[PDB]
Amino acid sequence: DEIVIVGVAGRYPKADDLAQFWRNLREGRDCVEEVPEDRWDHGRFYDPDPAAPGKAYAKWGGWLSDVASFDPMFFRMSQVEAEHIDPQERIFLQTVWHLLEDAGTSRAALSKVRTGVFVGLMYGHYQLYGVEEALRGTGAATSSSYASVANRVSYFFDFDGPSIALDTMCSSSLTALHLACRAIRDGDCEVAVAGGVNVSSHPLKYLQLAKGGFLSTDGRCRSFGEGGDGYVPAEGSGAVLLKRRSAAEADGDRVLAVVRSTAVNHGGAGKGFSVPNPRAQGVLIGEALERAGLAPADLGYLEAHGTGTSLGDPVEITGLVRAFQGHDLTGVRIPIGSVKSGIGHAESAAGMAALTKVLLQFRHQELVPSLHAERLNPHLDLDATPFRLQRDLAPWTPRVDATGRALPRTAAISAFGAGGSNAHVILEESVPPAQEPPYVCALSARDAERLHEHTARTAEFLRGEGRAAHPAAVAATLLTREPMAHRLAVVFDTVDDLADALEDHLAVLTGTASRAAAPATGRTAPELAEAWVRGAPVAAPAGAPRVSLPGYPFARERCWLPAADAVR
């Protein structure tokens, strides 16, 4: 019985949800910008001469839209606490809330299974803020506890399986996925959140990375491209929800991917400390394939580590070639790209970024552009291998059998930590297994102001990428979401008319929840829509189809230690 992914969520640069992320990837968007003014005054620290001492020669990053915004009330927390904790802890909370909404579940549905939490992190820089003040006695210390990221999730969501934070550098996300799958196979838990987060909250990181000559000079990751002399740091936060295949089937979950294999290892003593070992990479990927029960012949995409380093990208290919020794390579063509070329190197969340792209490419059956490699690296010699860099937007053509019929698509994601820790994962596409009006559309939120923005965004989604939707699916999906105090309901028959109705409210009932409200006076729809608004429970018609609506629009209260302004 194999492990499946049933939900995913995240934020990446220039993308505050996965629908935007998908658009950026199709358009081949370059999401890297210069250091925003509001993080820190990068001039204090900048100097393009890499020989300059105590200075950074690069000034770019993949930035999240706002990393200071948080809804502390929602998460049972004061403002002052929120100002003193790393935004990584804060954002990953929201991410995991959105994960449950994409899976179509909730704290309460998950309360009778044992849920674990595994999250990867590699930097904790926020804690550098306020040290002088706290020592002087005029302030309180900030925290960046890794464990806190996991533990606060486990607390809030009532997950009582393992709660573990791990650092394997760039591979942390996939290591977390690895351990989460093992935790399930071994019985530590039955469901698991596996994720990773990284926020660039402090200039010191840029000084660090420049001093090591790690940063590219043009601020890009030319994944397998010519003239790549480093990478560009990127922010991010993602997570996936994991379950057994059996339990997913039984709960009528939407399966996004089957986890065929995970594997992790380390370079040992190769060329030097924190230099990549082609050999270790090959053994890793080779074992991954054998565990997967899959041949390179059947491999459909390869999401590469793809840092964009002159020497590092070759090492990665050599690595693959080694894992492919002993198999028949003739005729075989495997497309290869890296999400880093679009968003940059999201560090502890790089695997989550890479995993999500693959997840999205499965659902939309397209291969997307990998950027900045018009000219391949001259060290490469790709033509001797099966690998072809996918520079263009293309349909993801499956492969067939003897009998000429199509198979589920496959993909393979690698992530190689700078300090030697490697991870690799093998994914298979999920191929799935009606109901007639009038339907009802329930909505909830913490207060009025949030219910407004929710309704609003839900309305916009019906006009945009979600008019092609099934209105039955839209009712069921919404009825999986956790109900809150301020409620709303509207009976309807088509997407068209639902969006119609709601628009008119904005420019259709509305109530506040009541715990001892009168039960629905019968399954007939306009009786349910009332049952909601007063605050009765009502469960979706089990086994209904489902869709990705927009997640809860959290409040955006600025939380940021004031004594962090000294770097602006």
- Residues from 59 through 118 that contact its own copies (CB under 8 A): 76, 114, 116-117
244 binds its own copies (CB under 8 A): no
Q: Which of 160, 328, 465, 496 binds its own copies (CB under 8 A)?
A: 160
Stretch that binds its own copies, among 183-191, 309-317, 394-402, 530-538 (CB under 8 A): 183-191
Give the shortest CB-155-to-its own copies separation in angstroms: 5
Give least dist CB 365 to its own copies, A.
33
Q: In a 3-state reduction of DSSP, which class is residue 543? A: coil
Euclidean distance between CA atoms 62 and 200, whole angstroms: 10
Applying CB under 8 A, among 12, 63, 70, 146 the residue interacting with its own copies is: 146
Total residues contacting its own copies by CB under 8 A comes to 75
DSSP annotation of 442 reads E
Residue 44 or 556: the one with the smaller Cβ distance to its own copies is 44
Is residue 134 involved in binding its own copies (CB under 8 A)?
yes
* Type and span of the H or E element at 149: helix 146-157
Please report whether residue 463 would count as binding its own copies according to CB under 8 A. no
User: What do you get for the CA distance between the two ends of the chain, in Å?
Assistant: 53
> Applying CB under 8 A, which of residues 175, 223, 338, 414 lies at the interface with its own copies?
175
Q: Does 154 bind its own copies (CB under 8 A)?
A: yes
Instruction: Mark residues 28-47: x for contact with its own copies by CB under 8 A, - for none.
Output: ----------------xx--
What 8-state DSSP symbol labels residue 439? Answer: E
User: Shortest gap between Cβ of 125 and its own copies (angstroms)?
Assistant: 9
Distance between CA atoms of 214 and 224, rounded to whole angstroms?
16
- By beta-carbon proximity to its own copies, the closer residue of 262 and 377 is 262
Nearer of residues 31 and 285 to its own copies, judged by Cβ: 285
The one among 182, 245, 446, 452 contacting its own copies by CB under 8 A: 182
- Min separation Cβ 447 and its own copies, Å: 22
Nearest to 149 by CA among 221, 202, 96: 96
What is the C-alpha separation between 174 and 352, in angstroms, rounded? 7
Q: Which of residues 251-270 bind its own copies (CB under 8 A)?
A: 263-269
Distance (Å, rounded) from C-alpha 529 to C-alpha 492?
10
Q: Does residue 188 belong to the site contacting its own copies (CB under 8 A)? A: yes
For the four alpha carbons of 163, 168, 171 and 174, in that order, the dihedral sign comes to negative
User: Which CB, 185 or 388, lies closer to its own copies?
Assistant: 185
Q: Does 311 bind its own copies (CB under 8 A)?
A: no
* Residue 489, strand partner residues: 442, 509
Residue from 1, 51, 53, 515 binding its own copies (CB under 8 A): 53
- The CB-of-137 to its own copies minimum distance in angstroms stands at 3
Across 327-470, where does the E strand assignment appear? Answer: 334-337, 366-367, 387-389, 394-395, 410-416, 421-429, 439-445
Token couple for 86: 């790393």
Give yes or no for residue 204 binding its own copies (CB under 8 A): yes
Smallest separation (angstroms) from its own copies to the CB of 146: 4
The yes or no reply on residue 139 touching its own copies (CB under 8 A) is yes
Chain residues 483-512 in contact with its own copies, contact rule CB under 8 A: none
Q: Is 431 in the site for its own copies (CB under 8 A)?
A: no
Whose CA is closest to 452, among 377, 528, 507?
507
Q: Please tell me whether residue 136 binds its own copies under the rule CB under 8 A.
A: yes
Distance from C-alpha of 547 to C-alpha of 505, rounded to nearest angstrom: 24
Q: Whole-number minimum distance, CB 202 to its own copies, in Å?
A: 9
Q: Determine the Cα angle at 365 with ends 494 and 254, to 5°.
A: 55
**Among 80, 108, 147, 506, interactor with its own copies by CB under 8 A:** 147
Task: State yes or no: residue 162 binds its own copies (CB under 8 A).
Answer: yes
Q: Which stretch binds its own copies (CB under 8 A): 16-24, 154-162, 454-462, 550-558?
A: 154-162
In the bound complex, what is the minimum distance in angstroms from residue 163's beta carbon to its own copies? Answer: 4
- List the one residue out of 10, 184, 211 whose CA is nearest residue 97: 10
User: Other C-beta atoms within 10 Å of 279: how many?
Assistant: 14
Interface pick for its own copies out of 225, 417, 535, 553 (rule CB under 8 A): 417
Question: Which of 150, 549 has the CB closer to its own copies?
Answer: 150
Strands of the 115-120 sheet, one edge to the other: 115-120, 191-198, 236-244, 3-11, 257-266, 421-429, 410-416, 302-303, 334-337, 387-389
Residue 235 half-sphere exposure toward CB, CA atoms < 13 A? 28
165 forms part of the interface with its own copies (CB under 8 A): yes
3-state secondary structure at position 476:
helix
